[PDB]
Amino acid sequence: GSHMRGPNPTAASLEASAGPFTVRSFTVSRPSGYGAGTVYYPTNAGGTVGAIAIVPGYTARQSSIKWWGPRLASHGFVVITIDTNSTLDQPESRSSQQMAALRQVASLNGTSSSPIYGKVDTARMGVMGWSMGGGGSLISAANNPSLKAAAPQAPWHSSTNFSSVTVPTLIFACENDSIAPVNSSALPIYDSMSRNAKQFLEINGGSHSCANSGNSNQALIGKKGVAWMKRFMDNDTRYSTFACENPNSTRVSDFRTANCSL
Template sequence: MKNLTVGLALTVLLAACAGVQSPPGAAPQDQPVTTQAVNPFERGPAPTTASLEATRGPYATSSTSVSRLRVSGFGGGTIYYPTTTSDGTFGAVAVSPGYTATQSSLSWLGPRLASQGFVVFIIDTNTIYDQPSSRGTQLLAALRYLTGSSDVRGRIDPNRLAVMGHSMGGGGSLEAAKTNPALKAAVALTPWNTDKTWPELRTPTLIIGAQSDTVAPVASHSVPFYTSLAATLPRTYLELRGASHFAPNTSNTPIARASVAWLKRFVDNDLRYSPFLCPAPAVGTTYSDVRSSCPFN
């Protein structure tokens, strides 16, 4: 009986050890990252560095144009979405262009994000001169249209929404997150805003600055925005080495890689993407400055 008891104990111990996984930061990024826990919001296969950097993800996409005459509170835009309905609903993100720009300045992001499993609405603003506070209000109006009236509303989980923007649109994404703390994620690309402090934000926030930005210099915009965020908030600052203010206006792999991982982690609650965010990437040829609140709660 004693030998039987010892044998059973050893069997249980070995089984438990076999189930132990390496910590997220140690996961090799050239291999798929998986999680044991079942997450109903996971969409798509396990990620790899190659899948995050690909110009298209696993989902086929389509798009539909929304006239400004059909909406109120913003200037219309283009919705990009996965064509499949077999995987359930998707999280959604509204995206604002910057000062004097239109949706075309960020059009590369539409199919790139949608093909990773999101409904993406790149908007036009009421006027090209709208300030960040107005752009934040318009992003929220776009999300209301997207989930309440759009032709693709049935594909969207209205409880998993995010905002994103460039320049004044990036400042607008912070404004939207301040107004609606229920948003799951905010991504600000070379953001500009006269408000430099954001301690009230409760939305996980990714800020991507550009080292050579002369329009929204990081010392007076991106860095103060980041440092003002609450210490308990999941947040990351990435500064693109040698890049200008307009880096987000053309296809950019570091921006896409970080944005997809951030949206997946916080909109889809997909822990398979944690190793691509924490530990934060090192300063080097891609980034001139990196700051993060890793590990995230």
């Protein structure tokens, strides 16, 4: 049950702004259980690809997280980026809306008129998001253990105990985060998970927006995000090296992993 699409990656090629596959996008016409959606898909991937739903933080919109659209989609995924019903939605609401976006992607996969008909393996899904949307991503993983992977960024939740989570979980953390401090949010969430493949990448002198569109580490962050999603959503062991690697870089202030078999 492996699903290998594309060429054998290299560090240099995963650090590039774009993967091998051409990306098109469209706006969701009638959003079902969320505010608005942009869908990114690869035009000719060679086989069905998994879907990733990405949710912003409090007051934020699609622009905060938009870069992940092409970065992942060009490596063979369907990515939906959402605006929430209200810019002031809390983490549990952000999780329900994340799962509704995945449901409507499974829907547009069965929709002869949609540009993604037949394009999706609906049994291969992942979740990502920023701050309260990263908290929602961890709530989606805890409630839906069939999800293949989770890669939240600068995660925010009112509770740090995610000990139930069995989904392979990569947490991007920002060293200088004053909004969701690492010592009280990202690290405690990471320390709670003992039943899963997990990783903690912390960006040297990073602010709260250190993994957002236009950050100064899209090379490293993008490489790690694609690696983690290819390893765990496709069971593609070509990406085991990149997924589990402790990057030798000054751009990283901390790195931890567990159950990440090479």
